[PDB]
């Protein structure tokens, strides 16, 4: 009795679901560590395939949990993890890559990421990224945390126009990229993930949002992520932990916001009006 999930294709033209999972500040409670890694089983049966990681999250301890999580089913997820801008020269790269695969347990990644802008010349990173693609150790890169002005610095580097996403904070309550960096990267065909799509937890307070989920016998961090869900060309990365969260997640996903929604959530969430700088957590 769920609808489908719409999927998001990348340029190289693999699609996935636009809702995903997010694994920020797993791997630091053992006594968690069973219920993270089976809300992450989870979520890939409900078809919330795609799960998002990075090397920083605990010193690899997240890159673990997924990697318990997806024995069995490698092919069942579509896995992305991260590289801090400290480690992204030519050869830290590889050598980041490489420790994440071994953390993850698996051959290949399907999606690497540049983490945020750092101090190693753009053009360093992106020929190590080239590098692993073509040695079947990834098999796409893209950016996180890229501002329009990086955006640009990036195309101008030999092999930058291969980029395969830009995951930047997007909610509700952070809307600013709609202004200028959304419009670009779909014009451009380059999803955007959005990361922290509830704003941390900080959104779920709002009495409009409270009050429409009410109206839809719905919480609200399910009417935060229906949202995300008209925006075409997102991905949007909720954090599971629980498998009841997971499921709370995707039925999230079942959600009609009628027409009169959308215009309150505009009211109450106003969309920009002009340039603002991109906001990171």
């Not at 053992?30 to 890694?37: F, G, N, P, S």
């Not at 290949?108 to 990421?113: I, N």
């Not at 869900?229 to 498998?243: D, F, L, R, W």
């Amino acid at each position: 009795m769920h609808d489908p999930i719409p999927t998001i294709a990348f340029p190289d033209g693999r699609k996935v679901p636009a809702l995903g999972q997010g694994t920020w500040r797993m791997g630091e409670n053992r006594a968690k560590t069973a219920d993270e890694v089976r809300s992450l089983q989870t979520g890939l049966d409900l078809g919330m395939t795609l799960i998002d990681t990075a090397e920083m999250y605990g010193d690899g301890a997240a890159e673990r949990i997924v990697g318990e999580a997806i024995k069995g089913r490698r092919d069942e997820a579509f896995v992305v993890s991260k590289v801090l801008p400290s480690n992204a020269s030519r050869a830290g790269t590889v050598a980041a890559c490489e420790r994440s695969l071994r953390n993850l347990g698996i051959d290949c990644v399907d999606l690497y990421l540049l983490h945020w802008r750092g101090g190693y010349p753009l053009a360093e990173t992106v020929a190590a990224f080239e590098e692993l693609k073509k040695a079947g150790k990834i098999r796409a890169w893209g950016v996180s945390n890229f501002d329009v002005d990086d955006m640009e610095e990036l195309s101008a580097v030999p092999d930058g126009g291969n980029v395969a996403a830009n995951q930047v904070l997007y909610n509700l309550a952070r809307r600013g990229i709609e202004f200028d960096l959304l419009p670009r990267c779909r014009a451009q065909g380059v999803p955007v993930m959005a990361y922290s799509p509830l704003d941390e937890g900080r959104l779920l307070h709002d009495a409009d949002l409270i009050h429409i989920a009410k109206a839809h016998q719905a919480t609200p961090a399910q009417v935060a992520l229906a949202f995300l869900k008209t925006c075409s060309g997102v991905i949007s990365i909720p954090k599971t932990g629980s498998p009841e969260r997971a499921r709370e997640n995707r039925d999230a996903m079942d959600i009609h916001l009628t027409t009169e929604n959308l215009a309150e959530l505009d009211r109450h969430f106003p969309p920009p009006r002009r340039k603002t700088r991109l906001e990171v957590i």
